[PDB]
Amino acid sequence: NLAEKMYKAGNAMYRKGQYTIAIIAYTLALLKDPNNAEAWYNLGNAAYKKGEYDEAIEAYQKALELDPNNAEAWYNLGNAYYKQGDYDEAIEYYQKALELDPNNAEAKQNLGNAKQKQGLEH
Amino acid sequence: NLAEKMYKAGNAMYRKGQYTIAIIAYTLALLKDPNNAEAWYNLGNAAYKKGEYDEAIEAYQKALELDPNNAEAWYNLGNAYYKQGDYDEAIEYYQKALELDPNNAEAKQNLGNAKQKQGLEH
Amino acid sequence: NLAEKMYKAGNAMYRKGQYTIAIIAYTLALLKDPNNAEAWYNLGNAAYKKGEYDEAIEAYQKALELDPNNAEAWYNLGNAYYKQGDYDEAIEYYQKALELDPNNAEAKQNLGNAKQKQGLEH
For residues B60 and B80, is the Cβ–Cβ distance under 8 A? Predict the structure, then answer.
């Protein structure tokens, strides 16, 4: 399974902070198997780590269409909107992450902070 | 757009002097989108920087079929033939680069030099 | 030929000990040209060097289906089974490597050692 081999090569680069090479491997995995939710998820993580928030959002949305139970993907999707100043969207995704995993202290903190910044009062 | 993402990954490696990895990313971009003139152009640049002149020529020819207005691609195609000792061809491509961008001092110098070396007098 | 270009990029990474990147390039070469015995062989070598013996076995089997005269591939297939403790299989593949190249001293030594360990006496 060359698609799974590429997903694994991508994970090894991602763990080492080699995000561009991780993205190349994940893209190759996704060209052979577009229904790999784990590869969409980690492709989104690599883009997030590079500061490419819009690209992270698009990859997390694909991962979530395939695996809606991935609590960490909802949390990371929330963080990508939070980084863009889209607080209403971040709140909604943090709440979904917390419905799935109530033990995510980072999701709790970020949700608390996004609620302070959500209002037109800035 | 995974093809554009690969073109961008290729540019990031190319800028850092990681030519082999740039070539992998450009090849993946070109397998998904063969009509990407920018990716053919930069694939030719990466091959040129590795000293692979024949491969640079083939990539520049594809880029130029798609984007004949790329003055820098005509200039680089001229340099790849110049590196092979094919002065008649270099002259022809430098003249085309200069018809498009008369302000390329490097194309002017290289054209001047290729004209000195063109003759059978060596 | 982009498939041959990927095989060459893979060899350049493999020679430098950049096994994960070599695997990415070989996979791309094999997606475009699955009948490239040299690319299956070197993909098996890269997996072997990473300690991924089962993956090396699968790649060597593909290389050997296409090029049964590759004496070094029979020898490396023998080493991958030897690393898994599968001595009967290692012996069989070392004997085939030695029928093709009787001058492989490493195959001779490894065959001699696998024969000592083959028995139920451990």
Answer: yes
